[PDB]
Every structure is written in structure tokens, then in C-alpha cells.
């Protein structure tokens, strides 16, 4: 849906136009705009509190933002940990079919997710990181073959949307490639961790469509 504004909010926002307050609009409003379409109550309550606080103490949002940016290395550490954990297969992906072809697919999916989760600990040595990138390539390569080997040969259930998750996996796989290239110019490693964690999620979605 869409956030609603009270009269008191309307008044406050109109009285809050000095330059120190622009980060409310330039950074927080786009956030509230995205939040709106998945979590309406949070978006509205958070905007409400931000607007009142900003109006009564202009500069507050800028202060909060700068302090969040200051704590960047907490977030890098946190994102590293998310990635490391992402490989911990819940055993709800493990294919219930005893066939060697579905056993082959599980192992190659565990393989790829395993290497990707170790990125935080290889990235600081260019030699080891280059190897890791090579291992990722072989893992992706070997998984796509097993998908294709099981695709035409076996299943073809009620869902042929298994085709789309391969198209998605590839799209996300190509995107991770771009992020690596961007990192080797930026040094901003957080983009790589975020990107590796998405590819893991996509690998899981392939494994989910075979069950449900």
C-alpha cells in the first residue's frame, strides 16, 4: 500500500527545509519508499519518528547517517559472517530421491556453496583469491552440467519453471563476475560478500523447485 501522513507530520515536513535536513529526504525517504512495498507499518512509523525528530532538531538525520557510516567495519564483519554461515545446508535441500543423478546434484551444490562461503578468508591474499575464483568457475561449471544432465533426462514434473531458475542462477552468476571486476578497482570487499551470498541463495532455489 502507501504510507499516510498526519496533519502534524505535514506541518513538520513543511517547516523542515534547511540544508542540514536534506539527508532526511535524499537518503531516508528513498529508504521509506522501498520499505513501503514490503513493510507498510515500519515504513510509516519510522518516517513518522524521523520527521518529528528532524523538525525539532535539524541536523539529526545527518548525524545518524554519519555515525552509521563510521561503523562500516562492523557491517563488513557482519556481512562476512552471514556469508560464512550461508553454506550450512539445513538438510531440507538434500534431494529425497535416492538416484545417483540427484546425489550428484546435491554434492555439486554443496561444493559451490562451500567455496563461496569461504570468500571472506581468501580475499586478502591475491594468490589464494585467484585460486578461489578458479575453483568457483569449476564449481559453477560442474553444477550447470549436472542440472542439464538431470533436466532433460529425468524430471519434467508439473513445473517447467526449473528452466527459469537456471536462467536466474546464470544472471546472478554473471552479476557476481561483474562485482569481482569492480572490486579489483575499488577494494570495497563488501560488494563481493553480498554478491556471493546471493549466488548461494540462487543455488538453494534450484534445489527447492525439485521438492515443491
Amino acid at each position: 500500500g502507501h504510507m499516510r501522513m498526519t496533519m502534524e507530520e505535514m506541518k513538520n515536513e513543511a517547516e523542515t527545509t534547511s540544508m542540514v535536513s536534506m539527508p532526511l529526504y535524499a537518503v531516508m525517504y528513498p529508504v521509506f519508499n522501498e520499505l513501503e512495498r514490503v513493510n507498510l507499518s515500519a515504513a510509516q512509523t519510522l518516517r513518522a519518528a524521523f520527521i518529528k525528530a528532524e523538525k525539532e532538531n535539524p541536523g539529526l538525520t545527518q548525524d545518524i547517517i554519519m555515525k552509521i557510516l563510521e561503523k562500516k567495519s562492523v557491517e563488513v564483519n557482519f556481512t562476512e559472517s552471514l556469508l560464512r554461515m550461508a553454506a550450512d545446508d539445513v538438510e531440507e535441500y538434500m534431494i529425497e530421491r535416492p538416484e545417483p543423478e540427484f546425489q550428484d546434484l546435491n554434492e555439486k551444490a554443496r561444493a559451490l556453496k562451500q567455496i563461496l562461503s569461504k570468500i571472506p578468508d581468501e580475499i586478502n591474499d591475491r594468490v589464494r583469491f585467484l585460486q578461489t575464483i578458479k575453483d568457483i568457475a569449476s564449481a559453477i561449471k560442474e553444477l550447470l552440467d549436472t542440472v542439464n544432465n538431470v533436466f532433460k533426462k529425468y524430471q519434467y514434473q508439473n513445473r517447467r519453471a526449473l528452466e527459469h531458475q537456471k536462467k536466474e542462477f546464470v544472471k546472478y552468476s554473471k552479476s557476481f563476475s561483474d562485482t569481482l571486476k569492480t572490486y579489483f578497482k575499488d577494494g570495497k570487499a563488501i560488494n563481493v560478500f553480498v554478491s556471493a551470498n546471493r549466488l548461494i541463495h540462487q543455488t538453494n532455489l534450484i534445489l527447492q523447485t525439485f521438492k515443491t
Binding site: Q131, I133, K134, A137, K141, K174, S177
Partner: peptide
């Protein structure tokens, strides 16, 4: 090392 990753995405 970077080559084979670029060679894979080229096939796709």
C-alpha cells in the same frame, strides 16, 4: 586464474 571464469560466462 581470472581467465576460466571469463571463459565460463562467455559460454553462457
Amino acid at each position: 586464474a581470472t581467465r576460466e571464469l571469463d571463459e565460463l560466462m562467455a559460454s553462457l
